[PDB]
Amino acid sequence: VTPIPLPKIDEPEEYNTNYILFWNHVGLELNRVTHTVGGPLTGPPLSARALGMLHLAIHDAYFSICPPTDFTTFLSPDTENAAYRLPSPNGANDARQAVAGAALKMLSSLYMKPVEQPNPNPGANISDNAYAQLGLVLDRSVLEAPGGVDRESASFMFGEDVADVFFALLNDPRGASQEGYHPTPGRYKFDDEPTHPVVLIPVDPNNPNGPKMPFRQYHAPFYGKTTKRFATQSEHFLADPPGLRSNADETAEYDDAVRVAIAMGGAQALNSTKRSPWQTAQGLYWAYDGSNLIGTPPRFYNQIVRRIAVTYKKEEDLANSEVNNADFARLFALVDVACTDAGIFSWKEKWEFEFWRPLSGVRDDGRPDHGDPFWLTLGAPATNTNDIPFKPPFPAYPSGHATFGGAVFQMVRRYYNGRVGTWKDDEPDNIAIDMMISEELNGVNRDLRQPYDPTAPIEDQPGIVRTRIVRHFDSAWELMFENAISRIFLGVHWRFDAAAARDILIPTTTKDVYAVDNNGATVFQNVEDIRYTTRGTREDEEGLFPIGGVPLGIEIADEIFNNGLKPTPPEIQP
Ligand code: VO4
């Protein structure tokens, strides 16, 4: 089978000499490959779940062999419930091999063609080529693993046993099913986006050349409400979005959000677009909208965390240092589990409210002086394809990017506080990173002029190459903020999808109306001054709740961290 030529990753080759980072890398490679071939575990929420499961398995295998002192394994060897019972080592003491067995078994269980009968519905739409391409990745990873892989060792066998428990417990086979779901048209309501109202896909994935059939995608409408949570200790809720329920009277906020959406998120050439060239770059930088050779946001978030992990490591040797191994195993488990639960709660709230995307909101507004029936957004980029930009197939409120980012970066901030600097947990840190390149703007990936060719390196395919932009950031607080506002620049999210407008924008004397500069561009608050303090009401619940994705992710990370990475009590699972 012709292996797909993958473009080079911008990262020091030394990172992969550490076996914890190496297995994270294999996970990221499978993420970008399934999104290129249309294999299993695609989309933002399930792709995050895959990495959370990989890192829990790695975490409990490693720490069972090299017992920690500050915390314990996620699961326990002494639990009464067989489902949450961790296997015992019994003499196995090679952590490298135990981690290899756990990582390999988990990734194989997740990406293998379902031989266990359960294929219909759950994955009855994935070609054999997809499975074969992912298999090649798994096969060569065995040969590239630092220190090699000994499948015959007891430690390796133990790790496999560890992955089995986690796989049985947390795998959600029908997680992304949409069967039975249909939008309900109306003001503020999500429906198929007007530039991609229907797509034509093969009737048989094994014959991608016709016949095709009409398909309308609704991404994981039942997941958030039915799936098992990983480590959260309660259910998380957001305030009703402007225009709906208890906040249906918040019309000045809504109308101004419509204004900001047009100015900041329109197509490049529209006379109404006020976004600057730099802001367009900040918008594309954080995309990772499930594109060919790129994958989803959790992939990028891990790429950033690898850099942070290595930049702030306690010891200089990446290959043979149990201190570095332990630090990385713990960090990635915390970050990826937080990313998984953020995906769950952002999806639960997305489909609870079914709030429409800005493209439809602006076009269908209905008022002659507020909407633009012909507006076009910069959009989510269809990188490495000759397709046009699109609107992700799921509700707007809250933003998945914003929630993932709040969780991932608040976790990094809780983990490194007192080690890299000192700050109050709800205030800006000093976790700086440099030489950070996004694959959306690396001087290699591009917008093609003809269909993508999976047998040729991307460099040999005609298109407009994305400018290479090397960035430096001063804090994880900045990372969290830019990640969220990037979606406003693409025009795929409303301001309140990221956070309360009051917390991120500059106020004017007019309530709910914010500042714009000379060229009518929105002015944001300096990162150092931002505090996510504005909360709102819910019609069905008493109390004040966070507004938008960032504050939601932040609360998810704090809860998990504060409870020391402990399973969600079986009592409160759906
Ligand atoms: O991923 V959004 O939900 O920020 O499109």
DSSP 60-113: HHHHHHS--SSS--SSBTT-SSGGGBPPP-TT---HHHHHHHHHHHHHHHHHS-
> How much distance in Å is there from the Cα of 265 to the middle of ligand 1?
14
Bridge partner residues of 464 (DSSP): 447
1-175 and 176-574 share one CATH topology? no
Torsion of CA 551, 308, 47, 563, to 10 degrees: -50
- What are the structure tokens assigned to 498, written together? 């990221």
Cβ atoms of 87 and 147 closer than 8 Å: no
> How much distance in Å is there from the Cα of 68 to the middle of ligand 1?
37
The reply to whether ligand 1 has any atom less than 6 angstroms from the CB of 391 is no
CATH code of domain 1-175: 1.20.144.10
Would you give the DSSP letter of residue 522? B
How many other C-beta atoms can be found within 10 angstroms of the C-beta atom of residue 61? 35
> How much distance in Å is there from the Cα of 396 to the middle of ligand 1?
7
Cβ atoms of 420 and 288 closer than 8 Å: no
β 463-465/446-448 pair status: antiparallel
Shortest CA distance to 99 belongs to which of 159, 24, 16, 29? Answer: 159
Q: Per the omega criterion (within 30 degrees of 0), is the bond before 205 cis?
A: no
Annotated resolution, angstroms: 2.0
The reply to whether ligand 1 has any atom less than 6 angstroms from the CB of 399 is yes
In ligand 1, which atom is closest to the CA atom of 401? Answer: 4
Q: Mapping DSSP to helix (H, G, I), strand (E, B) and coil, where does residue 15 land? A: helix
Q: How far apart are CA 259 and CA 277, in angstroms?
A: 20
Q: How far apart are CA 403 and CA 410, in angstroms?
A: 11
Q: How far apart are CA 290 and CA 298, in angstroms?
A: 10
Q: Which residues contact 542 (CB under 8 A, 6 or more apart)?
A: none
Work out whether the CA dihedral 123, 127, 128, 133 comes out positive or negative. Answer: negative
> How much distance in Å is there from the Cα of 486 to the middle of ligand 1?
10
- Which positions make up the binding site? 350, 357, 399-401, 487, 493
Torsion of CA 538, 544, 548, 553, to 10 degrees: -120
Q: How far apart are CA 43 and CA 390, in angstroms?
A: 14
The tokens 């001054």 sit on which residue?
Answer: 529
The reply to whether ligand 1 has any atom less than 6 angstroms from the CB of 493 is yes
Determine whether 401 is an active site residue: yes
- What are the structure tokens assigned to 411, written together? 């976790």
The reply to whether ligand 1 has any atom less than 6 angstroms from the CB of 492 is yes
Tell me which fold the domain 176-574 belongs to. Answer: Vanadium-containing Chloroperoxidase; domain 2 (1.10.606)
Q: How far apart are CA 503 and CA 534, in angstroms?
A: 7
Cβ atoms of 247 and 344 closer than 8 Å: no
How crowded is the C-beta side of 187, counted as CA atoms within 13 Å?
A: 10
Q: Which residues contact 218 (CB under 8 A, 6 or more apart)?
A: 178, 181, 183, 393, 394
Q: How far apart are CA 500 and CA 506, in angstroms?
A: 12
The reply to whether ligand 1 has any atom less than 6 angstroms from the CB of 392 is yes
For the chain, which residues make up each domain, given as ranges? 1-175, 176-574
The reply to whether ligand 1 has any atom less than 6 angstroms from the CB of 441 is no
- What are the structure tokens assigned to 7, written together? 């473009």
Torsion of CA 286, 291, 296, 297, to 10 degrees: 0
Q: How far is C-alpha 380 from the geometric centre of its chain's CA atoms?
A: 14
β 433-437/535-536 pair status: unpaired
Torsion of CA 532, 403, 429, 438, to 10 degrees: -130
Which secondary-structure segment (H or E) carries 334?
helix 322-353
Work out whether the CA dihedral 75, 78, 82, 88 comes out positive or negative. Answer: positive
Distances 54 to 28, 320, 353, 567 between C-alpha atoms, Å: 11, 22, 31, 15
Q: How far apart are CA 399 and CA 486, in angstroms?
A: 11
Q: How was this structure determined?
A: X-ray
List 25, 59, 236, 401, catalytic entry: 401
Q: How far apart are CA 500 and CA 504, in angstroms?
A: 7
Q: Which residues contact 488 (CB under 8 A, 6 or more apart)?
A: 260, 261, 264, 265, 283, 494, 495, 498, 522
Shortest CA distance to 336 belongs to which of 556, 138, 50, 87? Answer: 50
Longest distance between any two alpha carbons in the chain, whole Å: 75
In ligand 1, which atom is closest to the CA atom of 350? Answer: 3
The tokens 């409210």 sit on which residue?
Answer: 353
Q: How far apart are CA 92 and CA 79, in angstroms?
A: 21
Cβ atoms of 539 and 240 closer than 8 Å: yes
The reply to whether ligand 1 has any atom less than 6 angstroms from the CB of 400 is yes
> How much distance in Å is there from the Cα of 210 to the middle of ligand 1?
31
Q: How far apart are CA 569 and CA 79, in angstroms?
A: 13
- Which positions make up the binding site for vanadate? 350, 357, 399-401, 487, 493
